[PDB]
């Protein structure tokens, strides 16, 4: 029994407790690539918003400023981050702009079947945001009418329009020829008509296996038009643009 | 809602006790029983710890 104890201990150590979480074996090294990109090609005084799980690593490997990290001493701040990550992109833009954020970093394992990506944590982010702000963020709106948590063409219209969804699944149906992608973590199929566009953020970096995706908040319009209307203006050319009629605007102040 | 979400603050299933201690897991209760039949103060410390 003693000898068998030695053998069992050695096997358990070699198999389960001898792997770092920053490099994955297969090597898949997408964390250190995006962290070194942030460290090399971003201003030194730059604030990176992300979920708290990846706080320390950023501050330890990208050497940039964060908003939350693993030492979760203030929970309202974490709730603010998760509410920005669970709202429409306009609300998220206003929140993240108030906190002087430059970059957003998301984790997506739908291509290699990672499993510990951000979509899996979405429901938690949502629960915390719901706790602080019950009447703005509702967990029941991220399920389908039958109670399923889907991301395919049957996903709820609130899940479709969240920031995390459009920042994870952008350009993903076009990676596959024909336009039918398969999320290897969820075994659901994504169509190029499922993901709506982003009008307030711009993709600046995607790792080689698509694990880490870094977006940058775009600067506001000089004229004062909403970024949504600049986006619509770009995505639309019609001969008969509209009728003469008149704006319903209010009194000039 | 936050302490509930961290994976390190969750209850344990039985296999994880055998995975972390091969056969020391059924010698541990026997060693506590054997420390009870010869009760010394040091042994009382070990029993309370156990």
């Amino acid at each position: 029994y003693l000898y068998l104890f030695v053998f069992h201990s050695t096997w358990v150590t070699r198999t389960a407790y001898s792997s770092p979480s920053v490099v994955l074996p297969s090597l898949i090294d997408d964390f250190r690539e995006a962290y070194y990109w942030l460290r090399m090609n971003s201003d030194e005084d730059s604030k990176v918003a992300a979920w708290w799980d990846y706080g320390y690593q950023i501050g330890g490997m990208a050497d940039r400023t964060t908003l939350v990290d693993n030492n979760t001493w203030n929970n309202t701040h974490i709730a603010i981050v998760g509410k920005a990550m669970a709202s429409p992109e306009e609300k998220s833009y206003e929140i993240l702009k108030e906190h002087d954020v430059d970059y957003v970093l998301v984790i997506f394992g739908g291509l290699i079947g990672f499993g510990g990506d951000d979509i899996n944590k979405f429901l938690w982010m949502i629960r915390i945001s719901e706790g602080i702000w019950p009447e703005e963020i509702k967990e029941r709106d991220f399920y389908t009418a039958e109670g399923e948590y889907r991301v395919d063409a049957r996903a709820s219209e609130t899940m479709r329009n969240s920031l995390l969804y459009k920042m994870s699944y952008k350009d993903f149906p076009q990676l596959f020829n024909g336009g039918q992608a398969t999320d290897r973590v969820r075994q659901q199929m994504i169509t190029p008509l499922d993901v709506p566009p982003l009008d307030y953020f711009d993709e600046v970096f995607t790792s080689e296996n698509w694990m880490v995706r870094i977006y940058q908040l775009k600067k506001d319009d000089a004229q004062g038009r909403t970024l949504r209307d600049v986006g619509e203006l770009t995505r639309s050319s019609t001969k008969t643009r509209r009728s003469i009629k008149r704006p319903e605007l209010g009194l000039r102040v | 809602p936050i302490i509930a979400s961290v994976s390190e603050h969750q209850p344990v299933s039985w296999p994880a006790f055998f995975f972390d201690t091969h056969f020391l897991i059924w010698l541990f209760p026997a060693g506590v029983f054997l420390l009870f039949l010869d009760l010394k103060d040091e042994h009382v410390f070990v029993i309370a710890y156990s």
């Binding site: 979480s21 979920w51 708290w52 799980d53 693993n70 510990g116 944590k121 938690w124 | 979400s5 961290v6 994976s7 390190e8 969750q10």
Partner: peptide, 6 residues
């Protein structure tokens, strides 16, 4: 089992 979401 680490200090991370699940």
């Amino acid at each position: 089992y680490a200090n991370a979401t699940s």
